[PDB]
Design a protein around this ligand. Structure first.
Ligand SMILES: CCOc1cc2c(cc1OC)CN(C=O)CC2
Ligand SMILES: CCOc1cc2c(cc1OC)CN(C=O)CC2
Ligand SMILES: [Mg+2]
Ligand SMILES: [Mg+2]
Ligand SMILES: [Mg+2]
Ligand SMILES: [Zn+2]
Ligand SMILES: [Zn+2]
Lengths: 320, 325
């Protein structure tokens, strides 16, 4: 347990040993990392959150991530939380966001994939699932993650927001919904176009963002960057994330094949190129997003962008 | 004899001003079932889509049951009225041969389901009271998402799949169109929907035949969304004896919501305080700021097809205004 404490000293660093933390904590990385971050940011004292209520909520939330899903599980949630925590400290975003906006971004990251079944929105729609029927085919998973994350606050001794005012709770809820809905990959291109527009109109002394529309767009892109941060991490971490997403994708492909469905891109284990897929995803999605983020916060994201470019070069070199 | 009178009244299904409340009584509180059945026969939809008649009746009766008989306005009579009003608007000369049979089916089905399982309180009430519905739907078009989910889920009940003989591509296209239409009935979308309809009117293209030219999905679905929204907001355009009954019903529903807000220590929603209400000023305001701007624009889109409807709306506005001084 002293090993676990030593690993958590890196909580402010990109490249935290999140898999080691998952093992050392008895598969409770979300709980221990969220607790650590709330302490580092003084969020329990600021929002009068009882520590026992926080721990109880976090353990319940963590229990609703599926242990048999290779990628979209509590380790991914913990990684997105910790990554958002680092991005919130970008010098170019210094004191841009209120304590309530910080709480919203962190809470949104923690719940943003809760109860994920390990299959995509398109799979849920095409199989006429109960989830797609409930949500009218529109951000099916993301609406469900939000609903579960909020519903769990109603469990016994789980209301971590009990001492927020009515106004603060309504504002936080709206921001969390706006952030988690923006994690739907079908919204990526629109989010990126809006981030590009903001970079072009960037006002700086350090970023100056006067209206809520611009600030929520930054928080949306921030959590989206954290969600898409695997290729920007040290290679030993990134390769583990690649193994996990490919296992989850191949299992979806096995279900599609057993049902006689058309197999989704990257999901056909008999016809996959793991490495070409990573290079393509960096080239078309991850690098355009992170290059734009780096422009917004220049030069604070340079080391992250450097790692992403090194990792892209390495994956390309594994292709004969 | 009661069935004879019902059949006579259903002969008016192509007319604005159908005696929908009489039909509700004569049909044994099955206005949505009998009006939908009549419209499907009138448009030959059972034959076109190979819909078994017993499946249609079974679905319609189950759908109608899922409207709340104890809600004064948002009940099966309102659904039947919106269905029949959409059916009349679809027949307007400016739209002849514009929409496919599948698009017609989508608009009519959307109208039938568009308020199903409505609890008689607003989205804002459901959000402010931390309701299970608002928790499920993340405060976003709460009611309208629920109406769609119920209307589609009921197709899965025994002998209820009225779309069983559509192709897969037809079912997929119909589902998307119905979702787009019902979500556009959320009043929080009204201003943007109207702004877009005005832009279409200002740029509208007509064919050699004189009908509206709609050559992409975005324009086609926008017309159908505004058509069903106009039907949903059509009460002040109806003959006055129908309009006044609708006003009595919405006020009962509003006042019951306001009583719940007052008991909870909440600010009472506009028009919901029975101790500080002006029913007549509220109707004039409704017309001037919502219903007439919308219907004047729809009338411009289909000009001059909707002139008599617009004239009735203006006469009814004058009537309510005259009761104020
Ligand atoms: C190393 C991780 O690689 C990936 C992660 C994810 C995707 C694609 C990836 O690579 C092709 C697509 N997603 C959902 O569909 C989000 C997660
Ligand atoms: C004669 C009917 O009058 C009305 C009907 C409705 C509203 C307002 C009305 O008048 C002020 C507002 N709505 C929902 O909140 C839709 C239904
Ligand atoms: Mg997700
Ligand atoms: Mg009922
Ligand atoms: Mg409605
Ligand atoms: Zn995620
Ligand atoms: Zn309605």
């Amino acid at each position: 347990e002293d090993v676990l404490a030593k690993e958590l000293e890196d909580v402010n660093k990109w490249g935290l040993h999140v898999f080691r933390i998952a093992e050392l904590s008895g598969n409770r990385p979300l709980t221990v990392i969220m607790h650590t971050i709330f302490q580092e940011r003084d969020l329990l004292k600021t929002f009068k959150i009882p520590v026992d209520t926080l721990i109880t909520y976090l353990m319940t939330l963590e229990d609703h991530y599926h242990a048999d899903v290779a990628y979209h599980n509590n380790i991914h949630a913990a990684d997105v939380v910790q990554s958002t925590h680092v991005l919130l400290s970008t010098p170019a975003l210094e004191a841009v966001f209120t304590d309530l906006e910080i709480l919203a971004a962190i809470f949104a990251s923690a719940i943003h994939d809760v109860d994920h079944p390990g299959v995509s929105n398109q799979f849920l729609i095409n199989t006429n699932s109960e989830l797609a029927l409930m949500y009218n085919d529109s951000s099916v998973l993301e609406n469900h993650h939000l609903a579960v994350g909020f519903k769990l606050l109603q469990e016994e001794n789980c209301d971590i927001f009990q001492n927020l005012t009515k106004k603060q709770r309504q504002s936080l809820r709206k921001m969390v919904i706006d952030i988690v809905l923006a994690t739907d990959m079908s919204k990526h291109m629109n989010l990126l176009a809006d981030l590009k527009t903001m970079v072009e109109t960037k006002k700086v002394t350090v970023l100056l963002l006067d209206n809520y529309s611009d600030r929520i767009q930054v928080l949306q892109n921030m959590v989206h960057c954290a969600d898409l941060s695997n290729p920007t991490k040290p290679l030993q971490l990134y390769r583990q994330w690649t193994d996990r997403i490919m296992e989850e994708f191949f299992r979806q492909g096995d279900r599609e094949r057993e049902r006689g469905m058309e197999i989704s891109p990257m999901c056909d284990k008999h016809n996959a190129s793991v490495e070409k897929s990573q290079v393509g995803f960096i080239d078309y999605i991850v690098h355009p997003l992170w290059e734009t983020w780096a422009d917004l916060v220049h030069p604070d994201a340079q080391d992250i962008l450097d790692t992403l470019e090194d990792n892209r070069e390495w994956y390309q070199s594994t292709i004969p």
